[PDB]
Amino acid sequence: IVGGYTCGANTVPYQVSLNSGYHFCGGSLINSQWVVSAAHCYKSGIQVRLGEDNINVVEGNEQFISASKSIVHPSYNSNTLNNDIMLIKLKSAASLNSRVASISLPTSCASAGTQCLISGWGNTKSSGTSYPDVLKCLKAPILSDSSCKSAYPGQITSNMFCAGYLEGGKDSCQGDSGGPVVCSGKLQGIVSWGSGCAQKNKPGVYTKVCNYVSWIKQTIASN
Numbered sequence: 001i002v003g004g005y006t007c008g009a010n011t012v013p014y015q016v017s018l019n020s021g022y023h024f025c026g027g028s029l030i031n032s033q034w035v036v037s038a039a040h041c042y043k044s045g046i047q048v049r050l051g052e053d054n055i056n057v058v059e060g061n062e063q064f065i066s067a068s069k070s071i072v073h074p075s076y077n078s079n080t081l082n083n084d085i086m087l088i089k090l091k092s093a094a095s096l097n098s099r100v101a102s103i104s105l106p107t108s109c110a111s112a113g114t115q116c117l118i119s120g121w122g123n124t125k126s127s128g129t130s131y132p133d134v135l136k137c138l139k140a141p142i143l144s145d146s147s148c149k150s151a152y153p154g155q156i157t158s159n160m161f162c163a164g165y166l167e168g169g170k171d172s173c174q175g176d177s178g179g180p181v182v183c184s185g186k187l188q189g190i191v192s193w194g195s196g197c198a199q200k201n202k203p204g205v206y207t208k209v210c211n212y213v214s215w216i217k218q219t220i221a222s223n
């Protein structure tokens, strides 16, 4: 997250870190045994880390649970990043509490102008490289489909939306991949892609979660 703020320990209780020897992606806990992330975060050997603030220090509220299975969306295209969504099942159910909690799926799509919270352990620099240890947060509005398409000619599908600031300065970045965009207590987006970070007229692009609720529910119900 570039141009954000330090969230505060366990203030974003649905935020997970995906770890394969190191943090490589964010995710969102949607029930006691399932995480939603980006399909571009797919790899084998995933451990889900919940209750994290400082990802380099065991602070006492963590639960570390290995993934038993991952399900990449059947229509995910890695070139275009269309349908950039994946489900991860935990080998055992997380113990839910005030610091480890699920986030509700949307019942309807959020509109341009809706204020959301984006979070992650990604790069905090727009030019250089600096990775924070503690979770960073950014309040950002959803941008109109028209401005999103104008920002990225030929690249925005019906499964994507832009959020952030056309002036730049405040954005998601590398390492935030797969993490949450939460608006009014609903998971509306997944950190997906962009062009650099916090650059003028290049806002973050997010997977449009409301399009996938039926798939998520049916997949969970049979797996």
Ligand SMILES: Cc1cc(CN)c(C)o1
Pocket (backbone or CB within 6 Å): 171, 172, 173, 174, 175, 176, 177, 178, 191, 192, 193, 194, 195, 196, 197, 198, 203, 204, 205
């Ligand atoms: C994970 C990620 C988010 C964004 C949006 N600035 C980029 C380039 O990479």
Ligand SMILES: [Ca+2]
Pocket (backbone or CB within 6 Å): 052, 053, 054, 055, 056, 057, 058, 059, 062
């Ligand atoms: Ca920790």
